[PDB]
Amino acid sequence: PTMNMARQLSEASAWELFAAQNLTSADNEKMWQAQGRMLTAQSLKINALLQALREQGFDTTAIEQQEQEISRSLRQQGELVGQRLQLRQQQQQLSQQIVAAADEIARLAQGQANNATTSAGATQAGIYDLIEQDQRQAAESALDRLIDIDLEYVNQMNELRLSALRVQQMVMNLGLEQIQKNAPTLEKQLNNAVKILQRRQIRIEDPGVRAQVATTLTTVSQYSDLLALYQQDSEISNHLQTLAQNNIAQFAQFSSEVSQLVDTIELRNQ
């Protein structure tokens, strides 16, 4: 009978609205893909059902339309959460890299300070080995001057490790929520923190290491892009939000029209 159709029509709509529901969420690619497919398939089942009912003297032209508007609207939304999903993936990858790069710089900085600290200790320890008919003053004065230079490089490195950690934390602090509220602040904030890190970068002793820090710096300098990613993400998130409210009225009209047709079927059935 035609009654078995109304049950499927209700069912297709329950799964459609359910797929459309899950799609607009979608945390991972897998869910997005799976739900988009399901939505498409359900829309196809509804179209086939409507065409079956229509050739039963039943009128489906109001539902055919609404359902078509809804499929168009969800296509767009599906696309948008698709791009957004990508962005949120790029943000993670890029940020992952920047902290790693900042952390390597900090580690390289600590390494350098340790070398100077170990040297100064040796030199100073050397001043006490002087007692050996070795005219102190000549040596003592030179060793002392050497320890002061070592210690001076320690500060320079400790200041490098710090500049690097500052930036690492700032990046670890981005999250859209705050990139939205205080955006220009967080930005000009990192520009200095990075322009500083760069300044101190070009001040490393052995250019061999001053080189690795140079490559790492180029990676951390992409923070400006990681910012662009977060922006686009919010330009879409608000967008997707707007459409999510239009759905209410659309979905209200659609389901309400299914009910009306299902009735015309459970009433004409007797």
> Which residue range is the domain that position 43 belongs to?
1-270
Our CA angle for 250, 238, 86, nearest 5°, is: 105
DSSP string, 204-256: -SSHHHHHHHHHHHHHHTTHHHHHHHHHHHHHHHHHHHHHHHHHHHHHHHHHH
Q: Which residue has the tokens 């790069």?
A: 101
CA 1 to chain CA centroid, nearest Å:
53
Locate breaks in the chain with C to N over 2.5 A; list the residue preceding each: none
Q: Please, are residues 178 and 232 in contact by the beta-carbon 8 Å criterion?
A: no
What is the rounded distance in angstroms from the CA atom of residue 234 to the CA atom of residue 145? Answer: 57
What is the rounded distance in angstroms from the CA atom of residue 73 to the CA atom of residue 63? Answer: 15
**E strand or H helix at 158:** helix 136-172
Count of structural domains within the chain: 1
Method for this entry: X-ray
- Rounded to the nearest 5 percent, the helix, strand and coil shares of the chain are 85, 0, 15
**E strand or H helix at 197:** helix 183-201
What is the rounded distance in angstroms from the CA atom of residue 82 to the CA atom of residue 68? Answer: 21
Q: Please, are residues 70 and 254 in contact by the beta-carbon 8 Å criterion?
A: yes
Q: Based on DSSP, count helices (H) and strands (E) in the chain, helices before strands.
A: 8, 0
Q: Any idea what the CATH number is for the domain that residue 136 is in? A: 1.20.58.920
Of 220, 222, 165, 163, the C-alpha closest to 193 is 163
Alpha carbon distances (Å) from 95 to 82, 150, 227: 20, 35, 10
What is the rounded distance in angstroms from the CA atom of residue 182 to the CA atom of residue 202? Answer: 31
Alpha carbon distances (Å) from 112 to 159, 241, 260: 12, 51, 77
What is the rounded distance in angstroms from the CA atom of residue 148 to the CA atom of residue 100? Answer: 33
